[PDB]
């Protein structure tokens, strides 16, 4: 058979139509702006992808050239511009549009209305161009009646060997486009992974909760990092999606993981908060013998040794009840302030971004008092308030084991790292080592400037101390200002332990103590006057 595709380019609206039923409209007044790309398979005409690219605005043309390159060849692409798409098209995008046999596309100019439907890899089916006769005038709205030959059920599909990876590959690859080489006949990229097994692994039977929304592109990247991490048990992973969006679920099914959907109790940050609640209770219901639960969000890269790092450290959670969590994320650990991968800290905060929650804490304290949907509080800020944290601390590594790729942070690439002196992070033993470190550490010149490298001797390996004005345990004026000029996280006050911040400057360990609030002011010579910085 053959498909009557109807595409339409206009000033304020834009639509497509596949055998009588239009699968995308957009008469909205301020939005949708740029080229709209819709993608429908070549043997049934089902939509596999829907896109918008603001090439009226800079650099979205680069998003489009990428995406069209990720679309499998043979595939009928339809384009239909509205409002304006010329302004930042650039030679590269016009070149790709030429490649797909479009000639009115590469010559697209100011506020033109242009519609193109055609096959990727030839040939062209219908192109329709409209020229803006004046610069305030626009291309007369265009409508393009093309009939599009339907291919065999066999020529649209990729004939791989019948491995059931490739069975789930085909169920994904025939449903959504834009994921590229995972859906390409030749050189098909892997859909399961061969992570080196971690021996002595204590995190075997800890569930992994993946908190995801309608960002399938992020979640695909996330899961590939995760299922590649040393010692993963995909059995224990379940991806909680907040909504009934099918594309994020198809990515879950592509890797063959367990996917839970949740009806969005809204609004805003309350809505995220309720998804976290729902997902957490759900994880402990799917795994009632589970003492802990790993919580990862979909916008995170998972370091190679992430489960190596948890297995070594998780005994601390049950042996030390003054611990709130274990986190993979050092707020202060950027590439220039973090160095030791074997090293661990205690901090009086709850960083999130890949963390371990203990079952007892959740069902005995947190879940009963979890904020109602009426209140628009961030879940993590609420978990960091003293009624929830109750003065407990979180284990973090100096080099993080998660990377946040949403929308310069140091991230561990070395695998199978042996953490040093793990048991020295129980409450009292950590205090032993802290004092130990201040007794061996060389005090600095506190009349020299702390914001420049001049502050630290030109050396590597030594450990140093600086003292800053912290009048109360609530006075972070000087530290916030300090934080800014070393170019690390500055907004809120993170990584403090009894008034002590641990960081690295110029490959040397570097200790900041707030005087007099911190109980470590005892280590400060009377000669030294505590450093103080004011803001504006």
């Amino acid at each position: 058979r053959v498909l009557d595709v109807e595409v339409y380019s206009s000033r304020s609206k834009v639509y497509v139509a596949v055998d009588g039923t239009t699968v995308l409209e957009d008469e909205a007044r301020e939005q949708g702006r740029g080229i709209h790309v819709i993608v429908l398979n070549q043997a049934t005409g089902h939509v596999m992808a829907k896109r918008v690219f603001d090439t009226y605005s800079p650099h979205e043309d680069e998003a489009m050239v990428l995406f069209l390159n990720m679309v499998a060849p043979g595939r009928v692409l339809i384009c239909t511009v509205k409002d304006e798409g010329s302004f930042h098209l650039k030679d590269t995008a016009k070149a790709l549009l030429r490649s797909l046999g479009s000639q009115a596309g590469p010559a697209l100019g100011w506020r033109d209305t242009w519609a193109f439907v055609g096959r990727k890899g030839g040939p062209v089916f219908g192109e329709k161009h409209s020229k803006s006769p004046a610069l305030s005038s626009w291309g007369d709205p265009v409508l393009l009646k093309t009939d599009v030959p339907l291919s065999s059920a066999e020529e649209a599909e990729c004939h791989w060997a019948d491995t059931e990876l490739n069975r789930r590959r085909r169920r994904f690859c025939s449903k959504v486009e834009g994921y590229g080489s995972v859906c390409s006949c030749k050189d098909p990229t892997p859909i399961e992974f061969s992570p080196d097994p971690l021996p002595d692994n204590k995190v075997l039977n800890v569930p992994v909760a993946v908190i995801a929304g309608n960002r399938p592109n992020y979640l695909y990247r996330m899961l590939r990092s995760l299922l590649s991490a040393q010692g993963v048990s995909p059995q224990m992973i379940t991806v909680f999606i907040d909504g009934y969006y099918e594309e994020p679920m198809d990515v879950v099914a592509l890797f063959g993981l367990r996917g839970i959907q949740h009806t969005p109790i809204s609004i805003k940050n309350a809505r995220v908060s309720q998804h976290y609640k729902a997902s957490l209770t759900a994880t402990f219901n799917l795994f009632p013998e589970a003492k802990f639960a790993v919580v990862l969000e979909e916008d995170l890269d998972i370091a190679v040794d992430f489960f190596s790092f948890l297995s070594q450290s998780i005994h601390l959670l049950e042996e030390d009840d003054s611990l709130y969590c274990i986190s993979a994320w050092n707020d202060q650990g950027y590439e220039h302030t973090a160095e030791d991968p074997a090293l661990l800290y205690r901090v009086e905060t709850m960083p999130g971004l890949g963390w371990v929650l203990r079952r007892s804490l959740y069902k005995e304290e947190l879940e009963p008092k979890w904020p109602t949907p009426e209140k628009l509080w961030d879940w993590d800020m609420w978990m960091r308030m003293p009624e929830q944290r109750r003065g407990r601390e979180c284990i973090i590594p100096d080099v993080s084991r998660s990377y946040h790729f949403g929308i310069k942070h140091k991230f561990n690439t070395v695998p199978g790292v042996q953490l040093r002196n793990v048991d020295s992070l129980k409450k009292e033993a950590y205090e032993v080592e802290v004092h130990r470190l201040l007794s061996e550490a060389e005090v600095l010149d506190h009349s020299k400037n702390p914001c420049e490298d001049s502050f630290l001797p030109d050396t590597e390996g030594h450990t140093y101390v600086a003292f800053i004005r912290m009048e109360k345990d609530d006075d972070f004026t000087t530290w916030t200002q300090l934080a800014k000029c070393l170019h690390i996280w500055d907004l809120d006050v993170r990584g403090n332990h009894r008034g002590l911040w641990r960081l690295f400057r110029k490959k040397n360990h570097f200790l900041v103590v707030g005087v007099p609030a911190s109980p470590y002011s005892v280590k400060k010579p009377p000669s030294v006057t505590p450093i103080f910085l004011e803001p504006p």
Side-chain angles (χ1 to χ4, degrees), residues 2-10 12-89 91-97 99-118 121-153 156-185 187-290 292-373 375-451 453-459 461-468 470 473-505 508-522 524-536:
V2 82
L3 311 150
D4 169 30
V5 54
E6 265 289 64
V7 311
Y8 162 80
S9 201
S10 95
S12 205
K13 67 173 299 182
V14 84
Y15 92 81
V16 302
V18 169
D19 292 33
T21 173
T22 184
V23 305
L24 203 288
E25 82 310 337
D26 197 323
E27 331 186 16
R29 294 163 118 122
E30 300 304 332
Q31 45 185 30
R33 174 227 263 166
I35 292 79
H36 290 194
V37 178
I38 306 306
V39 188
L40 328 167
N41 41 30
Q42 54 209 232
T44 169
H46 278 113
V47 55
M48 304 174 78
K50 72 299 170 196
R51 288 307 147 87
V52 59
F53 303 101
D54 189 342
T55 83
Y56 173 82
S57 154
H59 296 150
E60 302 252 328
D61 60 345
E62 305 160 32
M64 180 179 66
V65 52
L66 184 95
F67 166 67
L68 292 177
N69 289 333
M70 317 252 268
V71 162
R75 263 282 317 106
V76 60
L77 318 166
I78 72 91
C79 296
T80 182
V81 65
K82 153 282 308 168
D83 192 344
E84 203 279 5
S86 55
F87 184 45
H88 271 104
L89 252 170
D91 280 290
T92 310
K94 323 220 208 217
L96 213 180
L97 293 196
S99 271
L100 320 180
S102 179
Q103 171 149 352
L108 199 176
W110 178 244
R111 282 210 245 255
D112 284 52
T113 56
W114 148 87
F116 165 44
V117 317
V124 184
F125 285 17
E127 173 149 58
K128 261 329 296 171
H129 194 171
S130 194
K131 252 140 48 151
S132 163
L135 183 143
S136 205
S137 290
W138 318 4
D140 297 328
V142 157
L143 211 157
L144 194 175
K145 271 121 87 199
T146 301
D147 287 22
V148 161
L150 203 288
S151 294
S152 80
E157 183 259 31
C158 263
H159 288 301
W160 297 297
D162 208 338
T163 169
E164 82 101 1
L165 325 170
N166 294 353
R167 272 149 258 179
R168 318 176 295 215
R169 173 153 304 200
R170 272 169 212 202
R171 314 175 83 63
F172 178 85
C173 275
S174 50
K175 179 100 146 190
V176 289
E177 200 64 45
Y179 290 77
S181 78
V182 80
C183 275
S184 93
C185 279
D187 163 32
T189 39
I191 271 290
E192 85 274 22
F193 300 87
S194 46
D196 252 339
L198 193 73
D200 58 80
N201 193 102
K202 320 273 191 321
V203 83
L204 261 279
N205 302 0
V206 187
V208 181
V210 168
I211 308 302
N214 177 29
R215 302 188 305 188
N217 39 272
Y218 289 10
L219 170 63
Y220 172 91
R221 198 204 174 175
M222 203 288 287
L223 296 174
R224 296 214 336 125
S225 56
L226 171 49
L227 284 75
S228 284
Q230 181 175 27
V232 279
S233 288
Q235 194 57 252
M236 327 283 317
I237 303 168
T238 88
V239 175
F240 305 85
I241 297 137
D242 180 27
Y244 301 109
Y245 311 97
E246 269 278 277
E247 196 165 326
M249 181 83 113
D250 293 293
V251 183
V252 175
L254 173 60
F255 299 106
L257 308 174
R258 170 179 207 69
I260 304 311
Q261 300 173 318
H262 159 87
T263 293
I265 322 159
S266 206
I267 182 57
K268 213 93 181 60
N269 52 337
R271 151 174 179 170
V272 193
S273 205
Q274 306 308 338
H275 190 226
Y276 264 87
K277 172 151 152 221
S279 315
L280 282 182
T281 89
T283 302
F284 295 126
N285 289 8
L286 305 185
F287 301 89
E289 324 283 36
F292 305 109
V294 167
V295 174
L296 322 172
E297 37 196 347
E298 60 177 348
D299 51 358
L300 302 168
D301 276 311
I302 308 290
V304 172
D305 76 319
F306 168 92
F307 291 106
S308 155
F309 153 81
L310 255 58
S311 189
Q312 300 181 57
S313 75
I314 195 163
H315 73 266
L316 309 170
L317 259 186
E318 214 184 314
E319 302 190 2
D320 183 335
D321 315 295
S322 78
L323 295 184
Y324 205 30
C325 46
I326 298 174
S327 180
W329 175 270
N330 177 12
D331 293 282
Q332 305 303 352
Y334 292 76
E335 188 111 357
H336 64 296
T337 70
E339 203 80 57
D340 200 319
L343 172 54
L344 304 178
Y345 304 169
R346 296 175 56 114
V347 291
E348 308 181 343
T349 187
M350 158 41 207
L353 276 47
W355 50 297
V356 170
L357 164 75
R358 77 197 314 168
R359 169 166 192 132
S360 70
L361 165 62
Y362 180 57
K363 298 228 69 144
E364 286 193 343
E365 315 176 31
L366 285 182
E367 193 203 19
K369 61 177 173 176
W370 197 278
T372 81
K375 307 166 214 148
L376 300 82
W377 306 345
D378 310 86
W379 66 273
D380 47 346
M381 278 281 103
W382 175 84
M383 266 187 80
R384 299 203 265 262
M385 304 215 272
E387 303 82 326
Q388 280 65 254
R389 194 181 17 103
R390 308 232 192 93
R392 292 167 274 199
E393 294 189 308
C394 208
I395 270 49
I396 49 167
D398 180 51
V399 315
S400 317
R401 318 272 153 181
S402 53
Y403 176 98
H404 190 256
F405 57 82
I407 317 316
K408 37 173 305 192
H409 207 83
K410 185 147 176 111
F411 178 80
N412 183 218
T413 70
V414 196
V417 179
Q418 298 309 93
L419 311 182
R420 84 162 44 113
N421 299 322
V422 196
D423 280 317
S424 73
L425 281 78
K426 304 188 214 199
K427 178 149 131 149
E428 80 158 66
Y430 190 70
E431 291 292 335
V432 172
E433 186 130 345
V434 177
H435 298 109
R436 203 273 272 169
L437 294 161
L438 300 127
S439 295
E440 197 219 346
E442 329 169 16
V443 184
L444 287 173
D445 184 334
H446 295 78
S447 98
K448 251 195 294 174
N449 163 258
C451 284
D453 175 43
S454 324
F455 205 61
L456 262 80
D458 299 46
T459 169
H462 299 139
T463 86
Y464 297 87
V465 191
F467 302 90
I468 67 179
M470 168 154 72
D473 39 10
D474 201 356
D475 184 53
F476 309 109
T477 44
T478 288
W479 162 254
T480 303
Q481 226 64 29
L482 210 158
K484 280 182 211 295
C485 65
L486 316 92
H487 302 286
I488 43 82
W489 166 267
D490 74 284
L491 291 325
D492 316 323
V493 188
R494 342 300 313 276
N496 52 314
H497 167 66
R498 293 184 184 185
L500 160 76
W501 291 263
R502 310 179 56 181
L503 172 159
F504 285 51
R505 270 184 92 165
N508 280 283
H509 204 153
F510 171 82
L511 310 182
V512 179
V513 185
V515 186
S518 164
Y520 305 101
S521 323
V522 297
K524 173 250 219 190
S527 324
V528 172
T529 183
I531 300 185
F532 165 37
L533 315 179
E534 32 199 339

